[PDB]
Write a protein that binds this DNA or RNA. Structure first.
Ligand SMILES: [Ca+2]
Ligand SMILES: [Ca+2]
Ligand SMILES: [Ca+2]
Ligand SMILES: [Ca+2]
Ligand SMILES: [Ca+2]
Ligand SMILES: [Ca+2]
Ligand SMILES: [Ca+2]
Ligand SMILES: [Ca+2]
Ligand SMILES: [Ca+2]
Ligand SMILES: [Ca+2]
Ligand SMILES: [Ca+2]
Ligand SMILES: [Ca+2]
Ligand SMILES: [Ca+2]
Ligand SMILES: [Ca+2]
Ligand SMILES: [Ca+2]
Ligand SMILES: [Ca+2]
Ligand SMILES: [Ca+2]
Ligand SMILES: [Ca+2]
Ligand SMILES: [Ca+2]
Ligand SMILES: [Ca+2]
Length: 92
RNA sequence: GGCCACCUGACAGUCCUCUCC
RNA sequence: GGAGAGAGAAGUCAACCAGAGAAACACACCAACCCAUUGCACUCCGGGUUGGUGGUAUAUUACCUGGUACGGGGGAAACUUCGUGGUGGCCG
């Protein structure tokens, strides 16, 4: 997609509990820039996926490039820019 | 006296309907 | 959301009333597995199995203790005793 503040991550290990997943995700993407929020749900349609909202688009980009395919909980991470702005960025 | 279905009724954390706030 | 009412599923129960009073079932939540899902969201929330926990279910229908209504005993009497849905079919 086109650059976005938020990156969409899928092909994540569905067995990891929400709290732990969000914490590890925060630990791995922290270095690219300030993270405004990380959204994760284990519902039928959202499981295996996560939305990491960066304060700066440039951070979404470096994070996406450097971490594409990163082995996370035994599965290579797939990353794309989110198709639309996350509410906090849009309502901003 | 027992066992199954069924009938009437008592009981009425889900759901539906109605009234009021 | 909340408060009433109707109906009523599941399940338990049976002469009626009252005091005590579980279980069953329904529902919700948690855990572990299994199945399904590769899904672009920002109003939580897939299914199944096993186990567990919970509620003005703080219910009421078993059971328990009192009386009430007919029946069977016994006793001068007083009174004291046991028993109390409809229907068909099948089991000695
Ligand atoms: Ca979780
Ligand atoms: Ca979740
Ligand atoms: Ca890790
Ligand atoms: Ca795996
Ligand atoms: Ca309710
Ligand atoms: Ca008001
Ligand atoms: Ca309210
Ligand atoms: Ca209410
Ligand atoms: Ca009713
Ligand atoms: Ca019934
Ligand atoms: Ca009671
Ligand atoms: Ca009780
Ligand atoms: Ca129970
Ligand atoms: Ca349940
Ligand atoms: Ca699974
Ligand atoms: Ca698909
Ligand atoms: Ca979208
Ligand atoms: Ca939205
Ligand atoms: Ca929600
Ligand atoms: Ca009798």
């Amino acid at each position: 997609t086109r650059p976005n503040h938020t990156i969409y991550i899928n092909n994540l290990n569905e067995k990891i509990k929400k709290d732990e997943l969000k914490k590890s995700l925060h630990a791995i993407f922290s270095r690219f820039g300030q993270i405004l929020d990380i959204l994760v749900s284990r519902s039928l349609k959202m499981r295996g996926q996560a939305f990491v909202i960066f304060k700066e688009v440039s951070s979404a980009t470096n994070a996406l490039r450097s971490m594409q395919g990163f082995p996370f909980y035994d599965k290579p991470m797939r990353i794309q820019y989110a198709k639309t702005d996350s509410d906090i960025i849009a309502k901003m």
